[PDB]
């Protein structure tokens, strides 16, 4: 047996462990949502858990006692079972063998046949129970209310204080009632990642809660962080469709690049020849880098290594060479040193990575290995990606060298030790250097990543050669020349695409959004409502009745409710009048609206007031035979509150480390 | 105002619409006004993108036309009186006979000299049309403000393209090429840029608003004091013995 | 899977508006492109233009200021106009649609059979339906021709059927002769055996979409 | 047609072909969009190739395609009977523009000589009670093409009130035709035959029909 | 979260009703470890220490001797690492049992629960106030008010 019911306001517990008093507090998280539909059951198989469940049931002779908890329930993975005697609260989470129609025999255990491994146990009119289960992070937690009534759940208000929280990491997914021929009953519903506004009173108790989703009129007393609405249009939010499907499309490559002859070869080049290797039209798969060589780790700049195959690259370089420890620190740009200046220099710009790792097993000898040669002497520092072969003799002095090594002339290279028993800081060290030309031309060097097809005229997640977005793609006349590959804005936004497959110009265009305002007489009033979506004809406003249509998730009914068009957009909720009033709640372009007679909103044009043809003739005058004598009043403001603010108190309050610090800013 | 007209403004004042041009009126702007990315207003569209839209006035141009045809109505057809009282019908002679005792003439100066004040405030308004008919710069002040405030807009959409130290002005870049602890200080920068343009612009509006309402009260001012009497103030209403 | 048949009328007279309509079973409208393409007898195709649901509606340049295609959810069909119609237009025309793996303006996939479209003045006029009937002596090798001869009608095309379409094998309908009247005339002829002709019933079913004209001859032996 | 097409292309069964489509460099030379469609004589195109190179499913491994600069080729390995139709190459044009170009028709060399088939009927009972007589000359099934059609009455030769269709290609890659003698009832009566002479090749074929006695 | 479950995974659509083969592979991998490999590949034992921070009575404290309580006076207060100055004064706030400390509008912690006595304590900025300067012209005289 299975009815429906409205939620109301129930469900309502305390969000945190900290005491509020007098006060209205924004939170987010796991609620039951406002008029939700909860199920009643009468008195089998197993409900879903969701996100949550809020269990209740107004009772008078306590049949229902338990609850039981898992997945499969069949003894194959850990699952929880609560049950209560007389005086005793018994919880355990044993790998119980459950029964298909679980129930406390009047005790027994006919609920389970078997129960193994229990990595956890805890012991410890008519009246309406109410309970939440939620099971985020590794904390099961319980919250618990009973009240008297004398109704399947009564309209009023009554917050949840926390029973239990218990710290077993279970994973739950389905859930059943457990009771002691008899009869029961009990409502469940399912909880929802909602914003709430509660009110705490001055007991520290809360009183009230607003749902900022259910409703416009919900939604403008969140953003006015009361509970009681003024007449007049609130700016409330903004409304925006969301995308549908996601698409990728990156280039038709399948050759595997060469990354193994690089990292795999049998001898590196010395650090003033270092080699250089270039990467292109191949899928780059970083993640077998590690299978390589031993390295600890990346070094990138400009990217991080775990983004590395999300993106495409137009070309890639591997230079690889042998440096000592010492000197892998001048690996970075902004470097200087023998390396940095005469060997091997990365521009200060660079976008890339540097793998080293240590190679004295292999670059080493007992007698020492003098293959590894470095430059130490030159005229000037080398630019950056600069390579300089040159063996000339080194001029220190002024006396020409004439090739030949001496006093003031020196040999420009210089042999590494690279012996064995050195120190770390000394021993050899395997250096490749990854430099990304980055995504400007066509893009040859890309990440793993299956491309999706082609969906025009929607509004989706696009992700080209990497560039992600959420628009809206269609067909372009944009005249692209053969070497462009996307159009930018003023802004600079990637206003237009090249498709890496079929080479076609596509128009990106925000999906689609705009301003919602809530017209509303005072709450004292009514709590009927009017909706102005700003600057849209009658037909952008969103209708489809899903969630990926809309950031509010209320929808104000698109077509009972009479919709009109304004200059200032589309007003639905509203009936217009072809009267003319004096302005109450102005719209715009000459719009306004009111609340009147049943009694409704109504829109109308605006009065500017009643005419009046003045009787003119050329002999003709009007002269007054009496007066009147009038006393009006005006209002003019004159002072206002002079107030006075302690800097440092305000920022720095009771701080001497914040006062220090704040001395600096002038 | 001519009834002709769709809009019941005088000639007058239909010239003065054609010298002023607004960059945006704040009406409805059709999805595919944008959509069909051949339009020239690729600022506005720009704009609208970015968050920045501009909202209509609550009084409508023909809404404005009617009330300063009522103020004229009213000042033609009974005097200073109707701003006083009810509206006392009196021949336009002897209201101007009125004003010119007003400025300290005897009312005989103007009935001896009546054809002759009626030709010159007739040549004086034929001039006036041909000197708004003529030089386009006419109406600076409105056009500055228009300027002004399309600039500011303009400034705050480009100030989208700023680094401000991060190591991209687009977000999705950072998001794809950065890890996401990585990648929130990079976020953090470009929030904190482009929130200070967002206060430099409202702090500017802001100004500028105190401005123009201080404009705004003196043309009310002066609303009152020429247009719904005679003004003794010398230079208020004009060069010369304010008259109407 | 889906289907695109094209209907309208088969004569236009010179510089009115001619109007076709395609009809898709098997599938819905959605977000398809939807393109009209147009073959003049004896030469080649020639594209026209296409729409999707979202609006605007892009067209041969060399047609734009004429053509217009538009696109009928609730009804689920697709509508194409073109105005100012001349002789030229007298061609096949074909609707056309994209699949989810080649979605554009080229995706020109799924294609309907074709309404032929014939731009005159000229009458339209039923076919005149008459049994041709072997002669006696070529009937006695065991094989009998027996045909319908669709004369003196107009304009193309017609469909001749054989026992309302039971009868398929060995059925051959000629191309249509020109004749110095500008009237057209084919002959569908069907090989039979002999012995079928005293005891099957042999109807030729002639059908003509611009005059609704459906003729049902019985063909005899010569008698 | 901004996009070319060779007008005729021929070949024997077992060998390559290849047929060209040359277009601008803002058709072909810009996207990779070119299809490929086959058309038989009565029929709708068929797509053959999409995407330059794509097949779509259910189309043989014979029919490839490629693109260099602003020329897109098909290349049909095997040549096969059935091959022998019409090819035409459409080109994403941009702005939402699709160019087609001129048509290829294929021609395949394994078709031997084949002689016509003639079937003569004379006109109706109920075409002769409306004062009309009409004489048929269906021939089909030859190749190649080309026949030469002459009436007869009893020996004379005739040359008015004969009307003859050109050749059209059947499914069977044969060719048909058909030819008609329009005659006054007192001219199908007054005669004691009337005859239909196919030549083809310079090979004759005749067939004669005469009034019946009742 | 924990996973250890040993189902053979799917790489392709054929189902691979618990046997390893093509598109059909077993989930775990063993780790190489031998004593020759390198820096990068030898083995690591790693221990993560999750906090759970303070919100409800603490349990996990570091070695800290606790003094006796001062009420009615500007002391500077530790309680359980939440650090401050103030004035300790007996609360009436009602706490429910759960809760541990209330907050005030800028979030400011304006009441604590001993840890040791479940009581509740107020508390208050010390005392301060702005302090100005009544002087006439030094070319005057150097006697000011306050
Ligand atoms: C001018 O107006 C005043 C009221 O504004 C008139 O005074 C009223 O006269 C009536 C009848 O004589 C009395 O019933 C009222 O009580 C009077 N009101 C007051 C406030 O005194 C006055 O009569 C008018 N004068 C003329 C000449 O019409
Ligand atoms: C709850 O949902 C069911 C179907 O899911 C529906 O029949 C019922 O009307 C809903 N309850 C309410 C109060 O609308
Ligand atoms: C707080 O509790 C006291 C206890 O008697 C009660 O009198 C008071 O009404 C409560 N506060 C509110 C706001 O109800
Ligand atoms: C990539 O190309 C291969 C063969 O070249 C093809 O099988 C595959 O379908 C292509 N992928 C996409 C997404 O088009
Ligand atoms: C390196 O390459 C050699 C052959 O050149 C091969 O035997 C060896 O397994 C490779 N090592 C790695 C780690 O790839
Ligand atoms: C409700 O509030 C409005 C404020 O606009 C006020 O005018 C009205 O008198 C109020 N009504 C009651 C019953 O308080
Ligand atoms: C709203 O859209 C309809 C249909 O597209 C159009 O006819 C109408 O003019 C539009 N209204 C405005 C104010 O743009
Ligand atoms: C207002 O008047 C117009 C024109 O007279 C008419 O079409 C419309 O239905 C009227 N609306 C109402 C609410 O009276
Ligand atoms: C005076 O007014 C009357 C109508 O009010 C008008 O006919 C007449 O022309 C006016 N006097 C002159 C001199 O125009
Ligand atoms: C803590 O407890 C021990 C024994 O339980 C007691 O000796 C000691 O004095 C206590 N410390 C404080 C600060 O109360
Ligand atoms: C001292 O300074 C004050 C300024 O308030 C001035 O009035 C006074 O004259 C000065 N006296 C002398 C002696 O300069």
């Given at each position: 047996?299975?009815?429906?019911?409205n939620?109301f306001?129930?469900?309502?517990?305390?969000?945190?462990?900290?005491?509020?008093?007098?006060?209205?507090?924004?939170?987010?998280?796991?609620?039951?949502?406002?008029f939700?539909?909860?199920?009643?059951?009468?008195?089998?198989?197993?409900?879903?858990?969701?996100?949550?469940?809020?269990?209740?049931?107004?009772?008078?002779?306590?049949?229902?006692?338990?609850?039981?908890?898992?997945?499969?329930?069949?003894?194959?993975?850990?699952?929880?079972?609560?049950?209560?005697?007389?005086?005793?609260?018994?919880?355990?989470?044993?790998?119980?063998?459950?029964?298909?129609?679980?129930?406390?025999?009047?005790?027994?255990?006919?609920?389970?046949?078997?129960?193994?491994?229990?990595?956890?146990?805890?012991?410890?009119?008519?009246?309406?129970?109410?309970?939440?289960?939620?099971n985020?992070?590794?904390?099961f937690?319980?919250?618990?209310?009973?009240?008297?009534?004398?109704?399947?759940?009564?309209?009023?208000?009554?917050?949840?204080?926390?029973?239990?929280?218990?710290?077993?990491?279970?994973?739950?997914?389905?859930?059943?009632?457990?009771?002691?021929?008899?009869?029961?009953?009990?409502?469940?519903?399912?909880?929802?990642?909602?914003?709430?506004?509660?009110?705490?009173?001055?007991?520290?108790?809360?009183?009230?809660?607003?749902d900022?989703a259910?409703?416009?009129?919900?939604?403008?007393?969140?953003?006015?962080?009361?509970?009681?609405?003024?007449?007049?249009?609130?700016?409330?939010?903004n409304?925006?469709?969301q995308?549908?499907?996601?698409?990728?499309?990156?280039?038709?490559?399948?050759?595997?690049?060469?990354?193994?002859?690089?990292?795999?070869?049998?001898?590196?080049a010395?650090?003033?020849?270092?080699?250089?290797?270039?990467?292109?039209?191949?899928?780059?798969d970083?993640?077998?880098?590690?299978?390589?060589?031993?390295?600890?780790?990346?070094?990138?700049?400009?990217?991080?290594?775990?983004?590395?195959?999300?993106?495409?690259?137009?070309?890639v370089?591997?230079?690889?060479?042998?440096?000592?420890?010492?000197?892998?620190?001048?690996?970075?740009?902004?470097?200087?040193?023998?390396?940095?200046?005469?060997?091997?220099?990365?521009?200060?710009?660079?976008?890339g990575?540097?793998?080293?790792?240590?190679?004295?097993?292999?670059?080493?000898?007992?007698?020492?290995?003098?293959?590894?040669?470095?430059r130490?002497?030159?005229?000037?520092?080398?630019?950056?990606?600069?390579?300089?072969?040159?063996?000339?003799?080194?001029?220190?002095?002024?006396?020409?060298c004439?090739?030949?090594?001496?006093?003031?002339?020196?040999?420009?290279?210089?042999?590494?030790?690279f012996?064995?028993?050195?120190?770390?800081?000394?021993?050899?060290?395997?250096?490749?250097?990854?430099?990304?030309?980055?995504?400007?031309?066509?893009?040859?060097?890309?990440?793993?990543?299956?491309?999706?097809?082609?969906?025009?005229?929607?509004?989706?997640?696009?992700?080209?050669?990497?560039?992600?977005?959420?628009?809206?793609?269609?067909?372009?006349?944009?005249?692209?020349?053969?070497?462009?590959?996307?159009?930018?804005?003023?802004?600079?936004?990637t206003?237009?695409?090249?498709?890496?497959?079929?080479?076609?110009?596509?128009?990106?265009?925000?999906?689609?959004?705009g301003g919602?305002?809530?017209?509303?007489?005072?709450?004292?009033?009514?709590?009927?409502?009017?909706?102005?979506?700003?600057?849209?004809?009658?037909?952008?406003?969103?209708?489809?009745?899903?969630?990926d249509?809309?950031?509010?998730?209320?929808?104000?009914?698109?077509?009972?409710?009479?919709?009109?068009?304004?200059?200032?957009?589309?007003?639905?909720?509203?009936?217009?009048?072809n009267?003319?009033?004096?302005?109450?709640?102005?719209?715009?372009?000459?719009?306004?609206?009111?609340?009147?007679?049943?009694?409704?909103?109504?829109?109308?044009?605006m009065?500017?007031?009643?005419?009046?043809?003045?009787?003119?003739?050329?002999?003709?005058?009007?002269?007054?035979?009496?007066?009147?004598?009038?006393?009006?009043?005006?209002?003019?403001?004159?002072?206002?509150?002079?107030?006075?603010?302690?800097?440092?108190?305000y920022?720095?309050?009771?701080?001497?480390?914040?006062?220090?610090?704040?001395?600096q800013?002038? | 105002?001519?009834?002709?007209?769709?809009?019941?403004?005088?000639?007058?004042?239909?010239?003065?619409?054609?010298?002023?041009?607004?960059?945006?009126?704040?009406?409805?702007?059709?999805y595919?006004?944008?959509?069909?990315?051949?339009?020239?207003?690729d600022?506005?569209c720009?704009?609208?993108?970015?968050?920045?839209?501009?909202?209509?006035?609550?009084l409508?141009?023909?809404?404005?036309?009617?009330?300063?045809?009522?103020?004229?109505?009213?000042?033609?057809?009974?005097?200073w009186?109707?701003?006083?009282?009810?509206?006392?019908?009196?021949?336009?002679?002897?209201?101007?006979?009125?004003?010119?005792?007003?400025?300290?003439?005897?009312?005989?100066?103007?009935?001896?000299?009546?054809?002759?004040?009626?030709?010159?405030?007739?040549?004086?308004?034929?001039?006036?049309?041909?000197?708004?008919?003529?030089?386009?710069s006419?109406?600076?002040?409105?056009?500055?403000?228009?300027?002004?405030?399309?600039?500011?807009?303009?400034?705050?959409?480009?100030?989208?393209?700023?680094?401000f130290?991060?190591?991209?002005?687009?977000?999705?870049?950072?998001?794809?090429?950065?890890?996401?602890?990585?990648?929130?200080?990079?976020?953090?920068?470009?929030?904190?840029?482009?929130?200070?343009?967002?206060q430099?612009?409202?702090?500017?509006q802001?100004?500028?608003?105190?401005?123009?309402?201080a404009?705004?009260?003196?043309?009310?001012?002066?609303?009152?004091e020429?247009?719904?009497?005679?003004?003794?103030?010398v230079?208020?209403?004009?060069?010369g013995?304010?008259?109407? | 899977?889906?289907?695109?048949?094209?209907?309208?009328?088969?004569?236009?007279?010179?510089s009115?508006?001619?109007?076709?309509?395609?009809?898709?079973?098997?599938?819905?409208?959605?977000?398809?492109?939807?393109?009209?393409?147009?073959?003049?007898?004896?030469?080649?195709?020639?594209?026209?233009?296409?729409?999707?649901?979202?609006?605007?509606?892009?067209?041969?340049?060399?047609?734009?200021?004429?053509?217009?295609?538009?696109?009928?959810?609730?009804?689920?069909?697709?509508?194409?106009?073109?105005?100012?119609?001349?002789?030229?237009?007298?061609?096949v025309?074909?609707?056309?649609?994209?699949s989810?793996?080649?979605?554009?303006?080229?995706?020109?996939?799924?294609?309907?059979?074709?309404?032929?479209?014939?731009?005159?003045?000229?009458?339209?006029?039923?076919?005149?339906?008459?049994?041709?009937?072997?002669?006696?002596?070529?009937?006695?090798?065991?094989?009998?021709?027996?045909?319908?001869?669709?004369?003196?009608?107009?304009?193309?095309?017609?469909?001749?059927?054989?026992?309302?379409?039971?009868?398929?094998?060995?059925?051959?309908?000629?191309?249509?002769?020109?004749?110095?009247?500008?009237?057209?005339?084919?002959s569908?002829?069907?090989?039979?055996?002999?012995?079928?002709?005293?005891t099957?019933?042999?109807?030729?079913?002639?059908?003509?979409?611009?005059?609704?004209?459906?003729?049902?001859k019985?063909?005899?032996?010569?008698? | 047609?901004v996009?070319?097409?060779?007008?005729?292309?021929?070949?024997?069964?077992?060998?390559?072909?290849?047929?060209?489509?040359?277009?601008?460099?803002?058709?072909?030379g810009?996207?990779?969009?070119?299809?490929?469609?086959?058309?038989?004589?009565?029929?709708?195109?068929?797509?053959?190739?999409?995407?330059?190179?794509?097949?779509?499913?259910?189309?043989?491994?014979?029919?490839?395609?490629?693109?260099?600069?602003?020329?897109?080729?098909?290349?049909?390995?095997?040549?096969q009977?059935?091959?022998?139709?019409?090819?035409?190459?459409?080109?994403?044009?941009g702005?939402?523009?699709?160019?087609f170009?001129?048509?290829?028709?294929?021609?395949?060399?394994?078709?031997?000589?084949?002689?016509?088939?003639?079937?003569?009927?004379?006109?109706?009972?109920?075409?002769?009670?409306?004062?009309?007589?009409?004489?048929?000359?269906?021939?089909?099934?030859?190749?190649?093409?080309?026949?030469?059609?002459?009436?007869?009455?009893?020996?004379?030769?005739?040359?008015?009130?004969?009307?003859?269709?050109?050749?059209?290609?059947?499914?069977?890659?044969?060719?048909?035709?058909?030819?008609?003698?329009?005659?006054?009832?007192?001219?199908?009566?007054?005669?004691?035959?009337?005859?239909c002479?196919?030549?083809?090749?310079?090979?004759?074929?005749?067939?004669?029909?005469?009034?019946?006695?009742?």
């Amino acid at each position: 047996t299975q009815s429906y019911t409205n939620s109301f306001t129930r469900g309502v517990y305390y969000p945190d462990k900290v005491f509020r008093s007098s006060v209205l507090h924004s939170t987010q998280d796991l609620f039951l949502p406002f008029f939700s539909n909860v199920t009643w059951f009468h008195a089998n198989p197993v409900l879903p858990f969701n996100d949550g469940v809020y269990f209740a049931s107004t009772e008078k002779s306590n049949i229902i006692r338990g609850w039981i908890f898992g997945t499969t329930l069949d003894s194959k993975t850990q699952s929880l079972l609560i049950v209560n005697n007389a005086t005793n609260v018994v919880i355990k989470v044993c790998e119980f063998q459950f029964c298909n129609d679980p129930f406390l025999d009047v005790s027994e255990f006919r609920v389970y046949s078997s129960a193994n491994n229990c990595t956890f146990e805890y012991v410890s009119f008519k009246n309406l129970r109410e309970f939440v289960f939620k099971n985020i992070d590794g904390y099961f937690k319980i919250y618990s209310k009973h009240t008297p009534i004398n109704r399947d759940l009564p309209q009023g208000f009554s917050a949840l204080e926390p029973l239990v929280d218990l710290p077993i990491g279970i994973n739950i997914t389905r859930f059943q009632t457990l009771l002691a021929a008899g009869a029961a009953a009990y409502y469940v519903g399912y909880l929802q990642p909602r914003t709430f506004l509660l009110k705490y009173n001055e007991n520290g108790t809360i009183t009230d809660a607003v749902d900022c989703a259910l409703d416009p009129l919900s939604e403008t007393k969140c953003t006015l962080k009361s509970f009681t609405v003024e007449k007049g249009i609130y700016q409330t939010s903004n409304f925006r469709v969301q995308p549908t499907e996601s698409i990728v499309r990156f280039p038709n490559i399948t050759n595997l690049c060469p990354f193994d002859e690089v990292f795999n070869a049998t001898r590196f080049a010395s650090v003033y020849a270092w080699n250089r290797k270039r990467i292109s039209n191949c899928v780059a798969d970083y993640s077998v880098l590690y299978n390589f060589a031993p390295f600890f780790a990346f070094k990138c700049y400009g990217v991080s290594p775990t983004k590395l195959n999300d993106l495409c690259f137009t070309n890639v370089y591997a230079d690889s060479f042998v440096i000592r420890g010492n000197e892998v620190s001048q690996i970075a740009p902004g470097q200087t040193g023998n390396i940095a200046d005469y060997n091997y220099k990365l521009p200060d710009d660079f976008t890339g990575c540097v793998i080293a790792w240590n190679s004295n097993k292999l670059d080493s000898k007992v007698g020492g290995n003098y293959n590894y040669r470095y430059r130490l002497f030159r005229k000037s520092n080398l630019k950056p990606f600069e390579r300089d072969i040159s063996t000339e003799i080194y001029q220190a002095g002024n006396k020409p060298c004439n090739g030949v090594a001496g006093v003031n002339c020196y040999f420009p290279l210089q042999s590494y030790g690279f012996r064995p028993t050195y120190g770390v800081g000394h021993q050899p060290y395997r250096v490749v250097v990854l430099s990304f030309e980055l995504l400007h031309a066509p893009a040859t060097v890309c990440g793993p990543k299956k491309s999706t097809n082609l969906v025009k005229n929607k509004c989706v997640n696009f992700n080209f050669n990497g560039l992600t977005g959420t628009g809206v793609l269609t067909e372009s006349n944009k005249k692209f020349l053969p070497f462009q590959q996307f159009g930018r804005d003023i802004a600079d936004t990637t206003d237009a695409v090249r498709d890496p497959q079929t080479l076609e110009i596509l128009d990106i265009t925000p999906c689609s959004f705009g301003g919602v305002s809530v017209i509303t007489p005072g709450t004292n009033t009514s709590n009927q409502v009017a909706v102005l979506y700003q600057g849209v004809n009658c037909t952008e406003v969103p209708v489809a009745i899903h969630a990926d249509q809309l950031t509010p998730t209320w929808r104000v009914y698109s077509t009972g409710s009479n919709v009109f068009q304004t200059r200032a957009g589309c007003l639905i909720g509203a009936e217009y009048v072809n009267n003319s009033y004096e302005c109450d709640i102005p719209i715009g372009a000459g719009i306004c609206a009111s609340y009147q007679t049943s009694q409704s909103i109504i829109a109308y044009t605006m009065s500017l007031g009643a005419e009046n043809s003045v009787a003119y003739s050329n002999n003709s005058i009007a002269i007054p035979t009496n007066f009147t004598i009038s006393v009006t009043t005006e209002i003019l403001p004159v002072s206002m509150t002079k107030t006075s603010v302690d800097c440092t108190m305000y920022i720095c309050g009771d701080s001497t480390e914040c006062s220090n610090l704040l001395l600096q800013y002038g | 105002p001519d009834p002709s007209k769709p809009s019941k403004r005088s000639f007058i004042e239909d010239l003065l619409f054609n010298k002023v041009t607004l960059a945006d009126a704040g009406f409805i702007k059709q999805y595919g006004d944008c959509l069909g990315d051949i339009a020239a207003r690729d600022l506005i569209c720009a704009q609208k993108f970015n968050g920045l839209t501009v909202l209509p006035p609550l009084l409508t141009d023909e809404m404005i036309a009617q009330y300063t045809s009522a103020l004229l109505a009213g000042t033609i057809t009974s005097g200073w009186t109707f701003g006083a009282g009810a509206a006392l019908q009196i021949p336009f002679a002897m209201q101007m006979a009125y004003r010119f005792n007003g400025i300290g003439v005897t009312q005989n100066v103007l009935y001896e000299n009546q054809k002759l004040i009626a030709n010159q405030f007739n040549s004086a308004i034929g001039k006036i049309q041909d000197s708004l008919s003529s030089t386009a710069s006419a109406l600076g002040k409105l056009q500055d403000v228009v300027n002004h405030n399309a600039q500011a807009l303009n400034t705050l959409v480009k100030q989208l393209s700023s680094k401000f130290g991060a190591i991209s002005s687009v977000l999705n870049d950072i998001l794809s090429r950065l890890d996401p602890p990585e990648a929130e200080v990079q976020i953090d920068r470009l929030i904190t840029g482009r929130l200070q343009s967002l206060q430099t612009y409202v702090t500017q509006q802001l100004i500028r608003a105190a401005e123009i309402r201080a404009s705004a009260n003196l043309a009310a001012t002066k609303m009152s004091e020429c247009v719904l009497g005679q003004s003794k103030r010398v230079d208020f209403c004009g060069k010369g013995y304010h008259l109407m | 899977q889906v289907q695109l048949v094209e209907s309208g009328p088969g004569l236009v007279k010179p510089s009115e508006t001619l109007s076709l309509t395609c009809s898709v079973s098997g599938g819905s409208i959605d977000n398809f492109y939807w393109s009209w393409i147009r073959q003049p007898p004896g030469k080649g195709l020639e594209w026209i233009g296409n729409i999707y649901y979202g609006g605007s509606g892009n067209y041969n340049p060399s047609l734009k200021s004429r053509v217009t295609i538009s696109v009928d959810t609730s009804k689920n069909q697709v509508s194409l106009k073109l105005r100012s119609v001349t002789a030229a237009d007298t061609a096949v025309y074909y609707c056309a649609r994209d699949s989810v793996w080649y979605t554009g303006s080229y995706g020109l996939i799924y294609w309907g059979p074709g309404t032929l479209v014939t731009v005159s003045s000229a009458s339209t006029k039923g076919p005149s339906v008459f049994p041709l009937a072997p002669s006696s002596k070529s009937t006695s090798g065991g094989t009998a021709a027996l045909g319908c001869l669709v004369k003196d009608y107009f304009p193309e095309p017609v469909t001749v059927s054989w026992n309302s379409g039971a009868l398929t094998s060995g059925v051959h309908t000629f191309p249509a002769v020109l004749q110095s009247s500008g009237l057209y005339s084919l002959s569908s002829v069907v090989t039979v055996p002999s012995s079928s002709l005293g005891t099957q019933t042999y109807i030729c079913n002639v059908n003509h979409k611009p005059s609704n004209t459906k003729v049902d001859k019985r063909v005899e032996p010569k008698s | 047609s901004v996009v070319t097409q060779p007008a005729s292309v021929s070949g024997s069964p077992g060998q390559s072909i290849t047929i060209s489509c040359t277009g601008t460099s803002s058709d072909v030379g810009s996207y990779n969009l070119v299809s490929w469609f086959q058309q038989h004589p009565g029929k709708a195109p068929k797509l053959m190739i999409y995407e330059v190179t794509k097949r779509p499913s259910g189309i043989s491994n014979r029919f490839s395609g490629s693109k260099s600069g602003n020329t897109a080729s098909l290349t049909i390995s095997r040549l096969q009977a059935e091959d022998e139709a019409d090819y035409y190459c459409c080109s994403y044009a941009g702005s939402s523009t699709v160019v087609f170009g001129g048509g290829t028709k294929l021609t395949v060399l394994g078709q031997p000589k084949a002689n016509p088939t003639v079937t003569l009927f004379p006109p109706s009972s109920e075409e002769l009670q409306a004062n009309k007589a009409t004489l048929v000359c269906l021939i089909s099934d030859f190749y190649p093409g080309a026949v030469t059609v002459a009436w007869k009455a009893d020996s004379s030769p005739v040359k008015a009130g004969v009307e003859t269709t050109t050749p059209s290609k059947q499914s069977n890659n044969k060719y048909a035709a058909s030819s008609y003698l329009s005659l006054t009832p007192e001219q199908w009566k007054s005669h004691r035959s009337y005859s239909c002479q196919v030549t083809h090749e310079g090979s004759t074929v005749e067939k004669t029909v005469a009034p019946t006695e009742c």
